[PDB]
Amino acid sequence: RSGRFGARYGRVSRRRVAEIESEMNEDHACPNCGEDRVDRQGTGIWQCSYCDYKFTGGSYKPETPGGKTVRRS
Amino acid sequence: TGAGTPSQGKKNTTTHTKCRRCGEKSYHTKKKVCSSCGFGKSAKRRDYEWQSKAGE
Amino acid sequence: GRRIQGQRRGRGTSTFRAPSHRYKADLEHRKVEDGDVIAGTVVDIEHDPARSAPVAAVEFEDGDRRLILAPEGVGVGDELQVGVSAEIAPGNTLPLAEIPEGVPVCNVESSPGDGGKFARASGVNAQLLTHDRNVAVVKLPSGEMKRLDPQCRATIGVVAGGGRTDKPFVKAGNKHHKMKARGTKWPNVRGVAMNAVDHPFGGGGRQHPGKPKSISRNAPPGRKVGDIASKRTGRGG
RNA sequence: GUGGAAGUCUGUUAGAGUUGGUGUCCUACAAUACCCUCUCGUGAUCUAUGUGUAGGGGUGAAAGGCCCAUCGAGUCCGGCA
RNA sequence: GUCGGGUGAGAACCCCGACGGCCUAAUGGAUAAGGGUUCCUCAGCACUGCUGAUCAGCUGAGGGUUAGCCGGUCCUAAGUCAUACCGCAACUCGACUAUGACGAAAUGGGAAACGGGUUAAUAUUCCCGUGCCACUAUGCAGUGAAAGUUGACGCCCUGGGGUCGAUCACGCUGGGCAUCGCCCAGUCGAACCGUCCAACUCCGUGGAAGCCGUAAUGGCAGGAAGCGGACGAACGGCGGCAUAGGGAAACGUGAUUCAACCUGGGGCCCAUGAAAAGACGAGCAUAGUGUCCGUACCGAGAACCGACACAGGUGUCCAUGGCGGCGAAAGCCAAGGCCUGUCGGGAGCAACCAACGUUAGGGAAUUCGGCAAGUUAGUCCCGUACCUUCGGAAGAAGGGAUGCCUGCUCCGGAACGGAGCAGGUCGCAGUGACUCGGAAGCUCGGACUGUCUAGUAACAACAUAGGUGACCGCAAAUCCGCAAGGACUCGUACGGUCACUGAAUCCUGCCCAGUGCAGGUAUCUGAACACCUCGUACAAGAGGACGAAGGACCUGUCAACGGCGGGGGUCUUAAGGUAGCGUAGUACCUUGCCGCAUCAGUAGCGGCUUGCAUGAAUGGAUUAACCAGAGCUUCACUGUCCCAACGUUGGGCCCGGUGAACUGUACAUUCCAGUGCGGAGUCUGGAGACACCCAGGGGGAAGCGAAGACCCUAUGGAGCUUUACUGCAGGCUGUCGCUGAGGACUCUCACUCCGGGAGGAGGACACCGAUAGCCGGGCA
RNA sequence: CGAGUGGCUUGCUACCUCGAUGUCGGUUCCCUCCAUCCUGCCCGUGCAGAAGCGGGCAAGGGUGAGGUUGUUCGCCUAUUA
RNA sequence: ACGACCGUAUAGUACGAGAGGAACUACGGUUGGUGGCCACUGGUGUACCGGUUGUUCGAGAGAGCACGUGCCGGGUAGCCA
Ligand SMILES: [Cl-]
Ligand SMILES: [Cl-]
Ligand SMILES: [Cl-]
Ligand SMILES: [K+]
Ligand SMILES: [Mg+2]
Ligand SMILES: [Mg+2]
Ligand SMILES: [Mg+2]
Ligand SMILES: [Mg+2]
Ligand SMILES: [Mg+2]
Ligand SMILES: [Mg+2]
Ligand SMILES: [Mg+2]
Ligand SMILES: [Mg+2]
Ligand SMILES: [Mg+2]
Ligand SMILES: [Mg+2]
Ligand SMILES: [Mg+2]
Ligand SMILES: [Mg+2]
Ligand SMILES: [Mg+2]
Ligand SMILES: [Mg+2]
Ligand SMILES: [Mg+2]
Ligand SMILES: [Mg+2]
Ligand SMILES: [Mg+2]
Ligand SMILES: [Mg+2]
Ligand SMILES: [Mg+2]
Ligand SMILES: [Mg+2]
Ligand SMILES: [Mg+2]
Ligand SMILES: [Mg+2]
Ligand SMILES: [Mg+2]
Ligand SMILES: [Mg+2]
Ligand SMILES: [Mg+2]
Ligand SMILES: [Mg+2]
Ligand SMILES: [Mg+2]
Ligand SMILES: [Mg+2]
Ligand SMILES: [Mg+2]
Ligand SMILES: [Mg+2]
Ligand SMILES: [Mg+2]
Ligand SMILES: [Mg+2]
Ligand SMILES: [Mg+2]
Ligand SMILES: [Mg+2]
Ligand code: NA
Ligand code: NA
Ligand code: NA
Ligand code: NA
Ligand code: NA
Ligand code: NA
Ligand code: NA
Ligand code: NA
Ligand code: NA
Ligand code: NA
Ligand code: NA
Ligand code: NA
Ligand code: NA
Ligand code: NA
Ligand code: NA
Ligand code: NA
Ligand SMILES: [Sr+2]
Ligand SMILES: [Sr+2]
Ligand SMILES: [Sr+2]
Ligand SMILES: [Sr+2]
Ligand SMILES: [Sr+2]
Ligand SMILES: [Sr+2]
Ligand SMILES: [Sr+2]
Ligand SMILES: [Sr+2]
Ligand SMILES: [Sr+2]
Ligand SMILES: [Sr+2]
Ligand SMILES: [Sr+2]
Ligand SMILES: [Sr+2]
Ligand SMILES: [Sr+2]
Ligand SMILES: [Sr+2]
Ligand SMILES: [Sr+2]
Ligand SMILES: [Sr+2]
Ligand SMILES: [Sr+2]
Ligand SMILES: [Sr+2]
Ligand SMILES: [Sr+2]
Ligand SMILES: [Sr+2]
Ligand SMILES: [Sr+2]
Ligand SMILES: [Sr+2]
Ligand SMILES: [Sr+2]
Ligand SMILES: [Sr+2]
Ligand SMILES: [Sr+2]
Ligand SMILES: [Sr+2]
Ligand SMILES: [Sr+2]
Ligand SMILES: [Sr+2]
Ligand SMILES: [Sr+2]
Ligand SMILES: [Sr+2]
Ligand SMILES: [Sr+2]
Ligand SMILES: [Sr+2]
Ligand SMILES: [Sr+2]
Ligand SMILES: [Sr+2]
Ligand SMILES: [Sr+2]
Ligand SMILES: [Sr+2]
Ligand SMILES: [Sr+2]
Ligand SMILES: [Sr+2]
Ligand SMILES: [Sr+2]
Ligand SMILES: [Sr+2]
Ligand SMILES: [Sr+2]
Ligand SMILES: [Sr+2]
Ligand SMILES: [Sr+2]
Ligand SMILES: [Sr+2]
Ligand SMILES: [Sr+2]
Ligand SMILES: [Sr+2]
Ligand SMILES: [Sr+2]
Ligand SMILES: [Sr+2]
């Protein structure tokens, strides 16, 4: 996690980098197929290693609260 | 690093060169302007009254 | 004294310019004749140097390949529409008039056909509230109620990249790399830390602004520093 | 166990710098040098060339620092005896 | 360097040989910039050269640079200029928009050349051999021709293919050494043409419900393994090239590790890593054409810049020569280069100085201070505290081992790779040289990496992430320009401008009276034009009505400037200091008082604390980690000291040669007293005093160096400040012109903005010109 | 209370020096003064002795090492004639 | 060019109720200062002899380099405390 940061920066800074990067690297369910094979390719860019579906999403998550709102309304 | 002797060693750039129009070594090959006759800057020849005493 | 940093800026010298020669494209809406008979296919998702957000490359029916300000949820293969009759789907562009009240939009035009001016940053969105024959009321990201010509075009959905601001930079080096992708002089030396000749707040044994920071709107450049025409300051009251 | 992150450690690798000796020198090898010690060395790193910003103006992670041995306002000639 | 010799009128330093040394990322090889003939030859030594000179980068006289395929030339990069347009009093000035051109010689892109031979000096340029590219012509072939591909690309980790080099095994050729039998060198051979293909991708077959695969990640019924196939790499293998070339000769064969080069897999980004010309796509023969410019040499402790033949500065590649070892480290040695980091001769060579070696006992007593020096040291095993943000602290600390020889085991395909075992054995000492941390505790500061005063300051200062406040909906906020115009901006509130504080953690009290900002405002005050009255045959002028911003007045606001006292059990002037911390880098008094520690402690640490004069983002407290930051203590060690000695190298001293500068009113062998503008070698009185020279350490010449940086003076200068004087930009506001029709209103036609356009939005407003009032250290 | 000597403290003055006479403390090295701390020789004592205390001659010699502090000064420690 | 001190005998005596406790003189030694000297002890001793690490001369023998000894041990003359 934020272990590469050693004893530098302090709790919060690296506590958040952890949670954020922890949720960032989890296997995500592709919107296309349903497989948990989505990985980030860069800022806001995600791709499924299974079907190759490349799409946009959050900076650190493939879906954001507001993003999930659009669908509803 | 001192501004004197040690910094004089890094000087190997060519700037002023023989001018095509006036013959002086004042044609700045980077600006493409002669600081002596104005070639590259003006059709008229570079000239100024302060190049001599006021009443002369 | 000497001109302050804010004054060096205006001259637009290299130190203050944005690395434009490195920027990708002007994400303005396509110009349609009419009818909405314009559709394209998302051919690729790219990084946008100027906004730290992703952008989508679209190939339109008539053969035009243009980068697009992509909302969240757009991926390769997906088909997008731009026109009055476009389908009410995330990623499609159409005039506010055709948009159903209560739908989040982005890249909203200020004046019909300008290409989009509002809500273009990471994870933001305007909220279309009211319709009418003469005025479409939109709520912008700052929360302000904006009255727009119903003929102003927008994209349905929120902008891609949301939450980019949730993670701290942690290091000066990270701030550095991002700043090198903008038109900004960084890092920032405090005014109080400079000599009197360089800033209204400079000078004095210990550091401190020898004056109140709230400055008048009418102040001339060189003097207008600190808290510009503040209606109030602090957290209290 | 694997993996190999890091403005991460050691390091006279290249390369960059300069804490102390208040050493040597101080009509010098040198108008800022020499030696040992010391610091950095995957990064906000270092470096070459090209290119841009000009004088009450630049440039400045700010020391009134730097803008060709000179800068709390460059240099040249003129105003000027 | 030394011994011989060569040349010469002349030889320490010009040349030959021998012996002795120096340089290994350089003192070797190729080059960029820059220099400009310094390059080669002959003849010279008046000049230049740290001495000499027969020598030379010097002097005289000649000579030397050869290209279709190496650069330029071509392309475009940041960006520059020219023309047009516009601004400007004007231009050699200035911004936009068009067009065109310019912009890369090591080191961006790019049609094509290799090997050998030759000269005093050139050489992929000449010559020999072999080859290749483009264009054009002719001929055959071909109707395809533009879609696509390439040029064309970041950082980190890594597999696979693979040449050179290096090394190992054995053979061949030559050399060296001579108790052995070892040691060294060589064993060659290009471009190009042809051929081979691993990886990646895809297709057929197949049919996995748990198997396939990797260094690692991973893969699959949306079809795994296996089997077959299409496409498909090297500056690489193989064959030709080659009874080419090269070598005195032999003119090898295999292997390991494998730079170059080829091709894959993985990871990272609030960071996304050029473009264009060109090329491929798109056959072959033969012929012709391929012009123009560069080409020498140095590339540095003498060819560049620094006034110099300057210990400085100055880019690229040779990063794979051997031993060593982790190593592109040290040390030693090759190839190659050099004895020119260019004055020599002499004295056991004194004093004194610069570098340095060794010092008995004591062991920091030295000193402001352990400054300087030293101590420790590599690797393996054991073991490791407080504290902590759980990462770290940590190599904590502390303890043990370490060579050689003989024979082996284990891991691995193996290494000339690594980890161990048993026995034997030497030394004072086995990281034997070299390389190579001394350690621990307490306190202050700044969180950290980072920045800085080129040339006396590296820090606690600046930056920083983090915290916070302010402005602005884009025809915006902020900023540059006289204007035409422009930066921010291929940007749009998750933005970017203006400021403050300065990681995390726990927190951040009271005050809006003054000042600042902002909002409001019945009434008051408030300019000009127009209007009204008086005045003038008119005009000047006097007064009036109306009244914008502004002010008065009210309100909001302190993470806004700042403030939080004295008195009594409130007063100034709003409040009257809360959490915390506290004799502080803030406490005058002060060496405060108590304690610790020491023989003794103005220090340090802990506590107390009434704080001369702490205190919450003028941030308070606190804090792991970090630090060439400030202070204190301990262990270890030591010539810092007691108290100095002996030694080493270079100077110093004598000799040959070369050969300056500083300084100089004059006189001058002085000493003791006195006197004098009171600080005399020179005056007075005494004393002393034969002249000259060598070495010395520096008492005096208020020594030399610099028209005192301190202080004051001058109706001197400059930089800076502000509620100093006076003005000037700039902003806000009214009014007049632009400007039109029907104290509130509609319209469209100027004008503005959006739109490719139609058209839409706005609209007599706004912009712009003029003027008036307010603000106005931003500027003079 | 009165009378003096010194020129070690401090103050006063502005005579010398602003075309410069480099601060304090320390250190090293040399000479000197006496208003004597020790040592030599004396006188008195509220001098038994031992020892104190006070005084006289006397400048030959000696007057040291350490802890805080830049300190001078001073405080402190163990030695010392 | 010598200054000063301690100790012994005098003497547990004179003196004094006791406690305590001298001197003249003769001796031995220490300290500070001074001049000189090297038999003794100690230091040095890049004369010399030995051991040994890396590397080069093929091994051996014998050597160079590793800064004016690579490092370590011993040490004559001389100079020194
Ligand atoms: Cl940012
Ligand atoms: Cl060339
Ligand atoms: Cl792989
Ligand atoms: K003076
Ligand atoms: Mg756009
Ligand atoms: Mg930048
Ligand atoms: Mg700052
Ligand atoms: Mg400052
Ligand atoms: Mg100012
Ligand atoms: Mg540059
Ligand atoms: Mg000759
Ligand atoms: Mg040549
Ligand atoms: Mg020389
Ligand atoms: Mg000793
Ligand atoms: Mg002392
Ligand atoms: Mg030290
Ligand atoms: Mg095995
Ligand atoms: Mg302190
Ligand atoms: Mg710091
Ligand atoms: Mg400096
Ligand atoms: Mg530093
Ligand atoms: Mg901040
Ligand atoms: Mg912020
Ligand atoms: Mg601060
Ligand atoms: Mg700070
Ligand atoms: Mg204390
Ligand atoms: Mg507060
Ligand atoms: Mg402050
Ligand atoms: Mg003067
Ligand atoms: Mg002054
Ligand atoms: Mg002045
Ligand atoms: Mg327009
Ligand atoms: Mg002023
Ligand atoms: Mg006077
Ligand atoms: Mg003097
Ligand atoms: Mg007397
Ligand atoms: Mg008595
Ligand atoms: Mg005397
Ligand atoms: Na792990
Ligand atoms: Na230094
Ligand atoms: Na100026
Ligand atoms: Na081949
Ligand atoms: Na090696
Ligand atoms: Na010579
Ligand atoms: Na660092
Ligand atoms: Na107030
Ligand atoms: Na305060
Ligand atoms: Na640091
Ligand atoms: Na010594
Ligand atoms: Na003298
Ligand atoms: Na000034
Ligand atoms: Na007197
Ligand atoms: Na005496
Ligand atoms: Na003392
Ligand atoms: Sr230098
Ligand atoms: Sr240069
Ligand atoms: Sr021009
Ligand atoms: Sr003229
Ligand atoms: Sr736009
Ligand atoms: Sr547009
Ligand atoms: Sr200030
Ligand atoms: Sr508050
Ligand atoms: Sr580092
Ligand atoms: Sr210093
Ligand atoms: Sr030293
Ligand atoms: Sr100097
Ligand atoms: Sr380092
Ligand atoms: Sr590395
Ligand atoms: Sr300068
Ligand atoms: Sr003049
Ligand atoms: Sr001659
Ligand atoms: Sr020559
Ligand atoms: Sr060109
Ligand atoms: Sr090139
Ligand atoms: Sr790189
Ligand atoms: Sr390999
Ligand atoms: Sr050449
Ligand atoms: Sr060279
Ligand atoms: Sr050099
Ligand atoms: Sr050699
Ligand atoms: Sr010479
Ligand atoms: Sr010895
Ligand atoms: Sr000490
Ligand atoms: Sr001491
Ligand atoms: Sr140890
Ligand atoms: Sr610097
Ligand atoms: Sr410094
Ligand atoms: Sr904080
Ligand atoms: Sr107020
Ligand atoms: Sr309190
Ligand atoms: Sr703090
Ligand atoms: Sr006389
Ligand atoms: Sr002398
Ligand atoms: Sr004088
Ligand atoms: Sr006397
Ligand atoms: Sr006495
Ligand atoms: Sr004094
Ligand atoms: Sr005192
Ligand atoms: Sr006795
Ligand atoms: Sr008794
Ligand atoms: Sr030697
Ligand atoms: Sr050692």
Any descriptors?
part of a larger assembly; 3 chains; A: 73 residues; alpha+beta; N-terminal domain of TfIIb; 2 helices; 4 strands; 32% helix; 22% strand; globular; C: 237 residues; mainly beta; SH3 type barrels; 3 domains; 6-stranded antiparallel β-sheet; 12 strands; binds chloride ion; binds potassium ion; binds magnesium ion; binds sodium ion; RNA-binding; ribosome
Question: Your description of this structure?
Answer:
- It is classed as ribosome.
- Keywords: ribosome 50S, RNA-RNA complex, protein-RNA complex, peptidyl transferase reaction, ribosome.
- This is part of a larger assembly, with chains A (73 residues), B (56 residues) and C (237 residues).
- Chain A has 73 residues and is α+β, with helices and mostly antiparallel strands.
- In chain A, 32% of the residues lie in helices and 22% in strands.
- Chain A has a single domain, classed as Single Sheet (N-terminal domain of TfIIb), CATH 2.20.25.
- The longest helix of chain A is centred in the N-terminal third of the chain and has 15 residues.
- Chain A is globular.
- Chain B has one domain: N-terminal domain of TfIIb.
- With 237 residues, chain C is mainly β.
- Chain C has 3 domains: 78 residues, OB fold (Dihydrolipoamide Acetyltransferase, E2P); 78 residues, SH3 type barrels, CATH 2.30.30; 78 residues, Irregular (Ribosomal protein L2, domain 3), CATH 4.10.950.
- In chain C, the strands form 3 sheets. Chain C has a 6-stranded antiparallel sheet with strand order 5-10-6-7-8-9, with no helix packed on it.
- Chain C starts with a helix and ends in a 9-residue tail after the last strand.
- The interface between A and C is medium-sized, with 33 and 37 residues.
- The site of one magnesium ion (MG) has 3 residues of chain C, from loops.
- One magnesium ion binds next to loops of chain C.
- Chain C binds 4 RNA strands through helix 1, strand 1, helix 2, strand 11 and strand 12.
The CATH H-level superfamily of the largest domain in chain C is Nucleic acid-binding proteins
Q: Major beta sheet of chain C, specifics? A: 6 strands, antiparallel
How many structural domains can be distinguished in the coordinates of chain C? 3
CA gyration radius of chain C, whole angstroms:
22 Å
User: Would you list the SSEs of chain A in sequence order as H and E?
Assistant: HEEEEH
CATH fold-level label of chain A: N-terminal domain of TfIIb
How helix-rich are the residues of chain A, as a percent range? Answer: 25-40%
The largest β sheet of chain A comes out as:
4 strands, antiparallel
